[PDB]
Design a protein around this ligand. Sequence first.
Ligand SMILES: Nc1nc2c(ncn2[C@@H]2O[C@H](COP(=O)(O)OP(=O)(O)NP(=O)(O)O)[C@@H](O)[C@H]2O)c(=O)[nH]1
Ligand SMILES: Nc1nc2c(ncn2[C@@H]2O[C@H](COP(=O)(O)OP(=O)(O)NP(=O)(O)O)[C@@H](O)[C@H]2O)c(=O)[nH]1
Ligand SMILES: [Mg+2]
Ligand SMILES: [Mg+2]
Lengths: 656, 656
Amino acid sequence: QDAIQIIDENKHFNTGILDYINKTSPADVGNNYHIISVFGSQSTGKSTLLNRLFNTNFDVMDELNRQQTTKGIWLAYSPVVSTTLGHTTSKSNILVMDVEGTDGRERGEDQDFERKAALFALSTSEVLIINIWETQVGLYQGANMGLLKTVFEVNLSLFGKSKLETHNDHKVLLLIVIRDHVGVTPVESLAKTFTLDLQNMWSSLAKPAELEHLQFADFFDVTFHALNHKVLQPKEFGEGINRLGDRLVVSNELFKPEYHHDVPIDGWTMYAERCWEQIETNKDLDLPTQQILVAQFKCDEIVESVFQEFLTKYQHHFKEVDAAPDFEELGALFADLRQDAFEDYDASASRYNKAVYEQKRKKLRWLINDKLKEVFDVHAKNLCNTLLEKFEKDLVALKGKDFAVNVKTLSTKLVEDVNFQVSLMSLQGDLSLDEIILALTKDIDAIVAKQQVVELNSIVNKSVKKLSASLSKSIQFELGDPNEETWDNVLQQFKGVYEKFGGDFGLGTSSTQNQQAIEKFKFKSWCQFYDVTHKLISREKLLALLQDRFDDKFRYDENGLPKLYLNEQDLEKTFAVAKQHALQVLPILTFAKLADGSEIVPDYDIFDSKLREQFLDDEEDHCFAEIITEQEKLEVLAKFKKEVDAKYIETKRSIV
Amino acid sequence: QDAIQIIDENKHFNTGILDYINKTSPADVGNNYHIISVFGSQSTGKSTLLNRLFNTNFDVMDELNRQQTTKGIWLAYSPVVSTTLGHTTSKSNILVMDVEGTDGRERGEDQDFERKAALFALSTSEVLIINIWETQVGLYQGANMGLLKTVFEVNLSLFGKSKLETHNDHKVLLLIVIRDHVGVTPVESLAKTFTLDLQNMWSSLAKPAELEHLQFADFFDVTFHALNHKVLQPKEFGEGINRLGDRLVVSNELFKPEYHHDVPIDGWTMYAERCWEQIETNKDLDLPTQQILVAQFKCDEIVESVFQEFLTKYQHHFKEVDAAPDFEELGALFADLRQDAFEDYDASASRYNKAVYEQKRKKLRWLINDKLKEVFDVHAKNLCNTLLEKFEKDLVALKGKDFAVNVKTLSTKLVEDVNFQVSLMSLQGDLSLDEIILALTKDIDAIVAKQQVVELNSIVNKSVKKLSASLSKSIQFELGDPNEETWDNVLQQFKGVYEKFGGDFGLGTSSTQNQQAIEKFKFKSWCQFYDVTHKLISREKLLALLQDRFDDKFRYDENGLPKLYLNEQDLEKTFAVAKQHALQVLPILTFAKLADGSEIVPDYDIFDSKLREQFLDDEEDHCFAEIITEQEKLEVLAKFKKEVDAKYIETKRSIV
Ligand SMILES: Nc1nc2c(ncn2[C@@H]2O[C@H](COP(=O)(O)OP(=O)(O)NP(=O)(O)O)[C@@H](O)[C@H]2O)c(=O)[nH]1
Ligand SMILES: Nc1nc2c(ncn2[C@@H]2O[C@H](COP(=O)(O)OP(=O)(O)NP(=O)(O)O)[C@@H](O)[C@H]2O)c(=O)[nH]1
Ligand SMILES: [Mg+2]
Ligand SMILES: [Mg+2]
């Protein structure tokens, strides 16, 4: 017949509870019992009253030292209820829970466990006695109104939902008993106060909106019972209790079915543990206490001040973007700014909790790093764009001079360059270079790519100038001796240097495109080839072509000698030599051919402007090798004679 | 003989205090008085005890309703001190201050004014009575230990410094009187508790480091006096008081000189007001109360959770940089992310204070804007670089085609382009474009500047090709008739087109440099001029120059006829015609001149490589107009005859 702690100081809900309850009462407890408990400030004579109203045996404080006595929560079976008729047994089994008192000492700061044990009780009991001293009544934290708001609050947030399902719910009785009541002030007056206090507490709690409509009466009954001074009025104490004894068993006005959640005790013993789990570790209840709470707000106050003492002192160094930047001047002046602030902050918050102080210092640190990274980022990008120009120039300055072997060194040295120059400002690596260096590389590789296409096309364009050169030249040089083997010693160079285009670049491959450097090149050659022809040999240069050959015999002789004539027989003999010596190369070059009497074709369908501007036409195809149209063709031999026979009989004047 | 409120409820320190004090005591108060005051929880019978120990007339609560009675702070002059000898006058004037009680109701939440009035008292009084009920003793906020820590704390922070200057300081008496003391528990036991409580309170307060060494005893004396129940033990109440009456006047063990800060009352009446100002509005004291404090931490808890429910849900959409970006896909998916979070946060904190809830919602907003601006900034820059390439190409594609009139439209349309394309993502302008658009312009103006120099130099380079052209041509065309007026019809074009260089550009000025486009140009002409000469006319082309003229008579006749000879007289007559018809242009062109027989000079000191590569030499200056050196000069007339007289008598073979 000793009690047990359902829950011990350090929160362990108890196993043998169900067991225990049954081993006390010889009867079978069914849906036949009540659950009653006590709440209040430490040493208000709670255990005392449970021992005296029911007839339990909890421990009470011996009056030698005013100290905490109940620890955790306890449960006992009431043998009998003290009443005016003396001792009385009851119908139902009355199970009583004695809670450790709220407040004072020992646990003076951390109201963790008092918020919790209170709520357990509030949540598990049909009747809750709120045991206050009459003198605490008009008080706030004296009346405990602060640990109340909360419990009732987390109560509603946590179990308020279970309603509207209609029982036989937890309506619960708030049976608020005033202690050491002298009598001067009528309990009815005390009652009006503490209910108003309870009503007030109610409009105050935070309420999930489904229940924003819910009132305190909906969840809760209140009633009051005053006791006289136990020490100075011992008789009128005992009678006051008795009177309360009668209240709950005799009158039977106190327990009602609304509070009994209506299932057998094993049910309750499980329902408690469930509520206990949900309670023991709640978020809403999980709270650091004041010192901390208040050291948070205090340090946040100091930050905004020290930081606003930082801002407009930076609106001043940096409202103007520095004209003459130095990265040692900057980085150092950064440190200084941030030094100033720390000490000032530290001269105001090294008082408070270290951890909070510390946490709120790092908050300050990074508030200012971020205002410094704006500035640093500006000059970081200015430096880069500048440095990047040089570099681009640098690449251009070198002009095909072993590209990739110069991409390596210069690009390397630039990245290195910034990573040194900037890091002088990174405040100890506080400010990062990672994203800058990254954005550099990207801008680097952007350049080479665009300068690579320029070195790629310059290489082609200057490969088509040591080709239109030795090409358009050995067109003529061979032509001082019209041969079977003209084109034999012409394409055997037109293709002796046509091939050595690829592999010589030195740049960096763009390998498929390194490959496509050629199919512009070869298309271009196959287009200058035709352009040399249609320019080197046309109507005009054609009419001329006669005398070029015509006159190295028609008027010179033997060993480079001007031809000395004899009879009209040595004059009328070296004239028909010319009537063919005017026509004897043309068969080699009427439509330009090879050495095998077959037509020359272009590698591409060209005159078509749909293949044209991939590299920058009549009926059949204004033929490729058609140097001269069939009509301008003999518009040369409509003037073969006009001037050549103007020289045979027209210079027959001499022999005269 | 009524009291006055030195300070009223709403903090107004009182003017007529000094006045008042003197009008009570008929004697002159000098350094002859004490200042005594009371502190404690509401309705602990404080005013009652001041009325009874001194013999004042403060108001007391009528016992009908338990409510607040003292408002603000009051001061009265004690007529006499109740003692065991009855009523007793004292030597010094005893001035008593009655404070409104701490806690409960009315002002239930805001402990602003109770922190303050307490401190005033703590700071201004030689003796402070801490009036607690015996039952509050082992309590915490019951014993008021919470408003204590603070006051003592802000006390030390605010006046602790004034020490070490050695007086006659404010040591102050903590005269702590226990009320309704039944007797069961020995006051000496109660005393040990509440001093330990006071000592504890002391190690707890935040202490500026100069005073980190300071103890509670250094600043403070404590002593205790218990009173019996006033209502139930009226006699033993009165005797208890008396006993205390004796304590302070008779025994005279209670006031001591250490507490009296030792200056005339007018001094005190000023010293109070000073302390009052410093107190009335203190930062350290300025505190919002719990509800708020606790709604701050609660919402911060929710942020980190809703935000960490945001982060790694973004580590997931954006760990990969999107391959196929769409700015409507993005901006919308941004909104969504931020929508999710708000509602979740709002489903957890719409409970708490709006303002805090609201403030901590904007904190959440911008926490996520900043994680979204990273992403947005990436795609913002990708889009730009791309768009910028096209643009650069675009500029190149146009090639001198009315530059500035095309800078206008394209640049305009690009800026517009991004400002539309990006703004689709700016979440309602939440994310700013200001810095992007700015960085665009800079990159735009960087391009034109670099492409302007390319159009500037291409213009020059292609202005020096319609010059080396019609120039190097009308060198010869004139030369088919060597004249007095050769150079008259040569520079009158060499300078007929030399001038029309500037004003035709169309680009955009770079006006001083638009001007400097020319001084490359004119230096280049003054360098191709010499290069045409030293190439068009040199040792080789020279040897040749003879026959060019030599053969249009030495062998042709009259009307383009090959010269029919007669006697050796018509053969030995048109030979000396050539001995000068080989030399008759040279006087026009030995050193190349004008029409006035004076030397031609270059506009610049040229062969010098120190003026050279601003645009890309013997003894005197390897003379400018020195087409041929004095030695190669007649190395032409060491071969004038070698071949020309090889044709006069060498082709005397014919007439044979
Ligand atoms: N003046 C007075 N004293 C009382 C009254 N009731 C009990 N006491 C005494 O006050 C002390 C309180 O002991 P107890 O009843 O154990 O207090 P409690 O509420 O259990 N506090 P806790 O368990 O939190 O430590 C006891 O010594 C008891 O004798 C009362 O109504 N008036
Ligand atoms: N039981 C008890 N009652 C007391 C005692 N002293 C005074 N009272 C009664 O308690 C009530 C307190 O009134 P008062 O003395 O004005 O209280 P107070 O400390 O001025 N509070 P406040 O001024 O803050 O409103 C009075 O009605 C008085 O009769 C005491 O020692 N024990
Ligand atoms: Mg107990
Ligand atoms: Mg009062």
